[PDB]
Design an enzyme around this catalytic site. Structure first.
Site, PDB file in Angstrom:
ATOM      1  N   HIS A  92     -56.801  68.713 -33.121  1.00 61.54           N
ATOM      2  CA  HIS A  92     -57.390  68.729 -31.792  1.00 61.54           C
ATOM      3  C   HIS A  92     -57.657  67.441 -31.026  1.00 61.54           C
ATOM      4  O   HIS A  92     -57.947  67.506 -29.838  1.00 61.54           O
ATOM      5  CB  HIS A  92     -58.688  69.538 -31.855  1.00 61.54           C
ATOM      6  N   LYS A 145     -47.382  77.768 -34.395  1.00 61.78           N
ATOM      7  CA  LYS A 145     -48.782  78.130 -34.184  1.00 61.78           C
ATOM      8  C   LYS A 145     -48.871  78.598 -32.728  1.00 61.78           C
ATOM      9  O   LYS A 145     -48.538  77.845 -31.819  1.00 61.78           O
ATOM     10  CB  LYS A 145     -49.689  76.915 -34.394  1.00 61.78           C
ATOM     11  N   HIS A 178     -64.064  72.175 -36.642  1.00 66.21           N
ATOM     12  CA  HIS A 178     -63.291  73.265 -36.057  1.00 66.21           C
ATOM     13  C   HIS A 178     -63.543  73.328 -34.557  1.00 66.21           C
ATOM     14  O   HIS A 178     -64.660  73.089 -34.101  1.00 66.21           O
ATOM     15  CB  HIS A 178     -63.678  74.608 -36.688  1.00 66.21           C
ATOM     16  N   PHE A 179     -62.496  73.624 -33.791  1.00 60.95           N
ATOM     17  CA  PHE A 179     -62.624  73.763 -32.344  1.00 60.95           C
ATOM     18  C   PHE A 179     -62.827  75.260 -32.146  1.00 60.95           C
ATOM     19  O   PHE A 179     -61.912  76.050 -32.367  1.00 60.95           O
ATOM     20  CB  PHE A 179     -61.349  73.288 -31.639  1.00 60.95           C
ATOM     21  N   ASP A 180     -64.037  75.648 -31.758  1.00 56.86           N
ATOM     22  CA  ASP A 180     -64.361  77.056 -31.573  1.00 56.86           C
ATOM     23  C   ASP A 180     -63.743  77.653 -30.313  1.00 56.86           C
ATOM     24  O   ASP A 180     -63.043  78.663 -30.380  1.00 56.86           O
ATOM     25  CB  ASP A 180     -65.881  77.240 -31.541  1.00 56.86           C
TER      26      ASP A 180
END
Length: 119
Positions: A6, A35, A113-115
């Site tokens: 990210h 992805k 983590h990128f929510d």
């Protein structure tokens, strides 16, 4: 994995240039399969890391302690195009300015983590 998947602080791509095509491959997200979606954050690493000490919120997936940025940030959403079939992975590049939500963990306590992006 957060940095690799990210973070891209020094970039600022435009609508459906080749950015995502290049970056998704460069960041190892087109190996074995393409992805489907991914977001890159174009802000200094330190500002993104500080989000872990901003507004606490409920995550948009498994728990893990999520925080929403006080300010909107410059990001880019990458989305697999319709006529794209592995090994050829094609993406639509969509720059946006939105508040982001990240999950933080560890010591140092940083994003892992990128929510999601808000709005």
């Amino acid at each position: 994995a957060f940095q690799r998947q990210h973070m891209d602080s020094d970039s600022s791509p435009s609508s459906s240039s080749t950015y995502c095509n290049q970056m998704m491959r460069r960041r190892n997200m087109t190996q074995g399969r393409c992805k489907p979606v991914n977001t890159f954050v174009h802000e200094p690493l330190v500002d993104v890391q500080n989000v872990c000490f901003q507004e606490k919120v409920t995550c948009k997936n498994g728990q893990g302690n999520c925080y929403k940025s006080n300010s909107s940030m410059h990001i880019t959403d990458c989305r697999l195009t319709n006529g794209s079939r592995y090994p050829n992975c094609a993406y639509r590049t969509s720059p946006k300015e939105r508040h982001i939500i990240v999950a933080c963990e560890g010591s140092p306590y940083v994003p892992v983590h990128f929510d999601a992006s808000v709005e």
